[PDB]
Amino acid sequence: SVGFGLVYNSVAEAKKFEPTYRLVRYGLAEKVEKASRQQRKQKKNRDKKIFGTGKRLAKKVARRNAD
Amino acid sequence: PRAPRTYSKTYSTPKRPYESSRLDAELKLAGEFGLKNKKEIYRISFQLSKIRRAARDLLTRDEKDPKRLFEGNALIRRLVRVGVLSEDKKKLDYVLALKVEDFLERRLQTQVYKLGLAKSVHHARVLITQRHIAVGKQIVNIPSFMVRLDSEKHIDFAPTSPFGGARPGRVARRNAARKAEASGE
Amino acid sequence: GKGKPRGLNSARKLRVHRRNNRWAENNYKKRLLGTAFKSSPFGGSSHAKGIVLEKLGIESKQPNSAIRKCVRVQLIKNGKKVTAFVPNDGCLNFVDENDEVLLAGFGRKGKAKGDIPGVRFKVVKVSGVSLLALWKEKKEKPRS
Amino acid sequence: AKVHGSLARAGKVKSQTPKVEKTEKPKKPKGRAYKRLLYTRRFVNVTLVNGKRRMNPGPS
RNA sequence: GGACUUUUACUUUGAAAAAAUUAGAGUGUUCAAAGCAGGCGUAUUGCUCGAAUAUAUUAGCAUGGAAUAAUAGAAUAGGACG
RNA sequence: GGAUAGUGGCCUACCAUGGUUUCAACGGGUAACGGGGAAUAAGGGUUCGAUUCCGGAGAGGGAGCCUGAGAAACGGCUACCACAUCCAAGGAAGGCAGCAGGCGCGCAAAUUACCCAAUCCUAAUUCAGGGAGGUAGUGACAAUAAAUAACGAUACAGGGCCCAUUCGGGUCUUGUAAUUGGAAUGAGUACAAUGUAAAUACCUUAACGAGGAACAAUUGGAGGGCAAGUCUGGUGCCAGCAGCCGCGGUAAUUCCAGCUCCAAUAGCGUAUAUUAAAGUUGUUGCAGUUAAAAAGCUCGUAGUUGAACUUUGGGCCCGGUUGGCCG
What we know:
This is part of a larger assembly, with chains A (67 residues), B (185 residues), C (144 residues) and D (60 residues). Chain C is α+β, with helices and mostly antiparallel strands.
């Protein structure tokens, strides 16, 4: 079997110069998994439709719960 | 948007469809060498036919023309390295001669037989294709491999498989299982 | 030197003449006028589908003496009508009228084939399935 | 010429030909082996030379 | 640097010239279509071959040719050089 | 002069009468984007290029324009034309010839999946983003390699061949065998490790996986061109065949079938087109008395073409490149 190998001059230098997926393969990095790609995108595209923090809009649509 | 992964074909195909004589000869080559396709012949006769072409075109050139020299001699050394062109006849007039048989006879198919190991070109086939025999420690399972002259000294058996040690194989051990389970405990 | 101008500058006259006489080549003419599209029941396409009007029994030419089973077909793409033979033994048993069939040429560029007059096409498939598989037994003609 | 003939008889002969089923027979070797059998047939053992040669004769 | 030069076609060599594609050299993708790799040791702290060449015509530039084939000239000498 | 970033009838004003054309203008046609190219192999050619690179053009049709270094931008705005969505009838919205996916059209073409790990691009920028781009799915488009079996024994038969006065079978194998024999292998299944962003296959590799019920090759053809029956049964100018010549009307070498055989072979048939064959487009290279074709005749412009003759002959040098006989 033939492949390739690296060996860093530190452990900090390895944890800083390495691809993160490798660190995941080894035992040095959690897989902080997140919302799906299109899930994320869709969340951003929801986010775009709002100007400001949003709380004023939430309370103004809470004003709707009467009229 | 990427690059074209180029390709080409390796066989031509006879102009006349049913010329009984050529069918005879083609058949003879097939049965003699243990080929499954007429294609396996066509292929060769196409490869060769390109060589010859390249040959003719050079022959028309002036003697000691840079291209005739460099490329002609390159082709010559190439046809020697494998085992098709003899060291005797070695100045591209024999490459204008030549024939398919010389190519045919140089296959791993043919070599793993012609000096033992087979007793038949078919046993040669069946052996090769079944992960037996190697050149280096490099196993090869292609009937049309072409044994490259100086590799002729290395057509032994495989480090694995029977006939070259390592393990009998699932069938033999299945029979050993039947003996050990019947005749004993 | 028989007609043709042999001079060194008479290129013009020569290729001009070549065009002129190219026009007497039947398939040059037809490829250039546009006939493949203009005329022809198919639009210049290789195949064409179409619905079955009625079932015909076309008496063959001489010196043969039979009845050639065919159908009249209206091509979907272009509404043109055209009569198509139904190959093999039976197969006129496989159609039924108002059915949606698949026609191909007869391999003569127009030109009716054998003893069948004016039929330049044939049936290849019916109802979605191949007529061949039907004639054997591989497949069976769909619902309706 | 006449166009509306009779379709009453289409598929006649096939439909009235006695069905004989296929005869179960020895397996024929698929591949290089068929070419083998073919070689040893045509150019090894030789059947006959009735004047010339016959690739498929019946009774004679 | 100053002063003037009849115009052409043909042919040669050259420059200017993307790649991929083709023709084609090298390398055993196990073979092969391909890819442009790879090959070697001290295989515990390197060593190293490459990644060629060819065609790329018509027109434009540049250069050598002076056959072939055109073109211009001194007859109301309003000619040639000084 | 104006206008432009600037050259210019680009536009305006004044003024003139010019500009192109049988060496084919102008107009029409194109199922016409252009090129690198592709298919076809004696050569000369013929045919084709919407399509992985380059250039141009467009974003349903047209115009207009804001912003800006750069747009006449459309995943920007404005108006009109066509289309069309939501409504509380007051109004408000959309532009897949991006990625998928749907309808329609048809002879004709795949997933509403995963990722920024590579290749690269952009931003205030090492991080953020990228349906660019990569990943797999579906995929007999085209292309490569090439499993479906290999080897003994044995039952009579042989051709070999020494001997033949004559049984014969005898050990060199030809193999046709309706009992056999143990060997062999991946197709698949599947620890493991490898692969990968994560996966899936592949190259690896434990346990498995071949005897005919199999892990079982197909597509056409067997009158000729054209490789392969003058077999049996069926039909009887019917049904059917047949690219073409032709077969079929009671012994069918072409139909429907069984047998046997051929050809190509994980592929084979077909329909359309195209190239070769085609010296049947003929520059190379056709043909025109009678087969297709010399205009009734002469003039004659454009066009093609067009006799001969002008430094030939002798002498000397210089230095190259092969090759010979020697080395």
